[PDB]
Design a protein around this ligand. Structure first.
Ligand SMILES: N=C(C/C=C\C=O)C(=O)O
Ligand SMILES: N=c1ccccoc1=O
Ligand SMILES: [Cl-]
Ligand SMILES: [Fe+2]
Ligand SMILES: [Fe+2]
Ligand SMILES: [O-]
Lengths: 303, 270, 299, 270
């Protein structure tokens, strides 16, 4: 048995993308919307469909923890996820399955590496709206076990550098958990890029004639970062990540993007851009690092 | 119009595990604040919680009855928070309308399963508010709003209450110093994270006891920065705005730790 | 023998997409722009690069002819293509080669099919800016011969249905020419979708913060139409086309899209969307019908 | 300010193949208009060509000197149209400035290799304008502009010329009826496509000779629809605008076919 990281996805969680799809789980109904980003996710969906992984691991900015890094530790979780900011677009009934064994492995290896880690064992816990949105976007069937990871406070409470350093440690902790368990895993970094936004609610939100970048410079930052990734210049994206954080208010400050690449060992590998679009002005890219195609997917002999 | 004013913690730890003595003292203090609230006979409770977060427009809770079971995303290990929260829809809806006339775009939020924050929930439970007798008008903590704007929302809401002939109890929900421990501790050994946070808490708590609004006002921004105060202490600004920058003094019914952070229950003497 | 129609691209011609790339042959220099559409074309470029075709045929809305359908008919054509509406973004020095044999075949086959056709024999003719833009966008190497076809007046001077019927016949004539000459060709319909537009650029044309759909209706029509052809419901696309043209003011009225599909025999085949985006508010999609993968390429 | 006025054809067929009798007569007639223009001693020639198409801003030619060889994309078989067009940058730039003050966003166009239209080129060649002595101020046919807006652009330009103390000759370049044949013909058998167009062309040609602006304006829009007239007859609106909606008669120097379409040379009497 060998553990494997099949691929890593930049899988952002803007809820408007599920709103525009009108799945059965979502209560409110739209007249469509954001189909560029949505078509980008159909490309992502079919790539994941072919992977047939054992587990999806996701790192969400909207489960914020102060005391270390937390992992969903209950086998079955469910609920009604209502978005606090866009309740008119996202009220989603969900029911998911947690890969508790791997989640515990991750927590274990994280602790061993010097992070403080916790298992979430309250079965009435409501999984965060960011996690539910990304999972639906990449996998609407809800047929793959998940490992939900919290985004520890460190990047904001301490500083970007120290927080990123924790996220790096978390990532290599995750890789080690995956490889010891022998799981065939896909990674999901639930981060949008530039997060400058519209401050106003636009009556009929699906109106794509009123959807565009909030700023020029923020869009310019997104393109520059997106180009480097598809160029395979991974060390250059991470060297630029802090300045990108500050000037573009990028959601990767939350840590998912660093956690993912740390788990993949920062591969100098060309990423595929399924698509880029804006939602309320914020830049969102749906992308993939196919480690299996690069031959970098296999981690080592499991225990 | 305002008959009562209180500041209470947003932490659920006093509710969830009162058998930790200092946590239990804080819960007992909140309970007492609720009794004082009731004795002032308000028709509505004007609530602001630091954990009720908005980023687009100002939100005002407009659902007549919101009921559920909430599990705090940090303190889930300590139990569940059942709630049955009533809103004064007529008054909340008037605040939504009045807000743009005071330069703040606002909406109501009336959705089944809308995530009411931990602070609002624990305050309701311990203080016995958000009932049919003491329904709530909850205004959001918009992350882009300053203290000055928060004061404007509070006064704006008090005026709407005066128009509807309703006595108002004002409740600000949030912590003091915010240096939460970043490792797991024994709850029985909980204490204020550091001495500097403790001194800052005690210093400002005494300014509030004395009713020294002038000195309090100039201390607040420095305090908020240096002691990492919950959300810039805007929950106090909420009280100040409702009181129109004037109160005679205060009674600190409790001051204690909450996983390294600071917390207090304060009864205000108008 | 074995003549082949490898694939058909919906390959629109916004000059802004070349402005954003800053190629050697385009004079003005941008700070980037329209990279979603440019990334869309990058995919289209890879697909064309792998096809290894003998020739690229292109039908352009910006070579307008009144008297029948015209074809490039001189071996080498070159010049400086300056966009009359957007001269600050597009001033492109070009040099292309024409597959004169095939172009003559197309004309003769159109003639035999009842269409009036003509060969352009004037060596100083300046190939139109739309043809030059589309060609650069899928093949910036300029190393594949082309057949430049004009857009006859009929859709506008007569009406949409009579115009589309001439494009249908032109498409069939084109198919026969490729079949007879044994060429392995790709088709290029140089049409944008919805053409409602802004009434000015914002001083900085590259400012993508000011780039969005002109109208909600136009965008919705575009999405509806390209989703349909993504489902391979070609018959349904062409039934909606006259209404789409009227309401979305779509450039497909020019006839390239009908010409391409007519030559492909309206394949009920799922098309691949490389990307959708907006330029000055106009709807532009870059798409492919891979007849080689569908086993429908051989004639 | 305005010293002469002409309407001439946009078709290149008279210039390119004058050996065809009907096309030669129109070519000769345009040259005769050229002489009449020279005799009025203008400082600039105010030109509008039906085939100079704009879509966004109104365009005004501001390049001091444009030269090249234009090949018409319909009539390339009959030869090449070499040109050396001189512009009055001062007056054209003044027209670019004045345009938005009259409600029309406008821009200058100064680029090496800008596609000057066939109409403007053949008009320069045959009339002998676009020289250093008779430089052009060319304003585009914007497709979204009506006849009334076209007049506003022309009068705007004439006012700019008044300020610069310049004598202006006005030239409208475009055809009459537009029922072009849709198959190849023997040029020697060219004629107006049908009687109806001929009847219409002749009817309004007579209205112009009389100087009956009131009646002409009544006919123009109906004429334009029914006889498929080149670009709504806006090249006439250009002349009427430049003459402030008034003139006293005209001489029709020539009238004949251009591949089914109608074409004419009109000398106006101010
Ligand atoms: N990160 C995002 C981006 C965009 C819109 C809505 O969420 C978020 O707010 O969750
Ligand atoms: N079809 C087009 C759409 C948009 C802008 C410029 O180029 C075009 O001609
Ligand atoms: Cl809390
Ligand atoms: Fe987010
Ligand atoms: Fe076009
Ligand atoms: O166009």
């Amino acid at each position: 048995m060998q553990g494997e990281i099949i691929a890593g996805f930049l899988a952002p969680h803007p809820p408007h993308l599920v709103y525009g799809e009108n799945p059965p789980q979502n209560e409110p109904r739209s007249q469509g919307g954001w189909e560029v980003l949505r078509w980008a996710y159909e490309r992502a969906r079919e790539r994941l469909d072919a992977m047939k992984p054992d587990v999806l691991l996701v790192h969400s900015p909207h489960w914020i923890t102060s005391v270390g890094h937390h992992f969903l530790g209950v086998p079955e979780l469910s609920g009604k996820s209502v978005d606090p900011i866009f309740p008119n677009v996202f009220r989603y009934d969900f029911s998911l399955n947690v890969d508790v064994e791997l989640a515990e492995a991750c927590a274990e290896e994280g602790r061993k590496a010097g992070l403080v880690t916790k298992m979430m064992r309250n079965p009435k816990f409501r999984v965060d709206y960011g996690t539910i949105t990304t999972l639906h976007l990449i996998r609407p069937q809800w047929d793959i076990p998940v490992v939900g990871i919290s985004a520890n406070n460190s990047p904001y409470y301490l500083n970007t550098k120290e927080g990123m350093s924790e996220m790096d440690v978390l990532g290599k902790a995750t890789r080690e958990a995956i490889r010891k368990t022998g799981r065939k895993a896909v990674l999901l970094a639930s981060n949008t890029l530039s997060h400058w936004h519209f401050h106003e609610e636009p009556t009929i939100p699906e109106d794509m004639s009123k959807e565009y970048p909030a700023t020029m410079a923020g869009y310019q930052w997104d393109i520059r970062m997106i180009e480097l990734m598809r160029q395979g210049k991974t060390s250059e994206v991470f060297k630029l990540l802090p300045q990108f954080i500050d000037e573009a208010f990028a959601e990767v400050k939350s840590g998912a993007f660093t956690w993912m690449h740390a788990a993949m060992q920062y591969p100098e590998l060309a990423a595929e851009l399924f698509g880029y679009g804006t939602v309320i002005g914020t830049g969102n890219a749906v992308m993939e690092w196919d480690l299996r195609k690069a031959g970098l997917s296999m981690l080592g002999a499991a225990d | 119009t305002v008959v009562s004013a209180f500041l209470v913690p947003g932490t659920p730890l006093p509710q969830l595990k009162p058998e930790v003595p200092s946590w239990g003292q804080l819960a007992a203090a909140t309970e007492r604040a609720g009794k004082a609230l009731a004795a002032s006979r308000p028709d509505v409770v004007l609530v602001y919680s630091t954990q009720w977060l908005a980023v687009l427009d100002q939100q005002w809770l407009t659902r007549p009855r919101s009921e559920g079971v909430h599990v705090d995303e940090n303190w889930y290990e300590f139990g569940d928070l059942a709630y049955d929260i009533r809103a004064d829809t007529a008054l909340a809806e008037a605040c939504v309308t009045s807000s743009p006339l005071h330069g703040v775009h606002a909406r109501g939020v009336n959705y089944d399963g809308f995530p009411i924050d931990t602070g609002t929930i624990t305050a309701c439970t311990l203080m016995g508010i958000g009932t049919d007798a003491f329904p709530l008008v909850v205004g959001s903590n918009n992350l882009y709003h300053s203290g000055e704007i928060t004061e404007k929302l509070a006064a704006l809401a008090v005026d709407c209450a005066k128009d509807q002939n309703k006595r108002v109890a004002v409740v600000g929900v949030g912590g003091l110093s915010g240096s939460l421990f970043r490792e797991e501790i024994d709850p029985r050994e909980d204490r204020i994270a550091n001495e500097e946070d403790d001194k800052w808490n005690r210093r400002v708590l005494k300014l509030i006891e004395a009713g020294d609004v002038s000195a309090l006002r100039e201390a607040m921004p420095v305090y908020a920065k240096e002691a990492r105060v919950d959300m810039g202490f805007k929950h106090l600004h909420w009280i100040l705005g409702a009181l129109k920058g004037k109160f005679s003094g205060a009674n600190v019914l409790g001051y204690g730790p909450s996983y390294g952070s600071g917390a207090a229950v304060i009864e205000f003497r108008l």
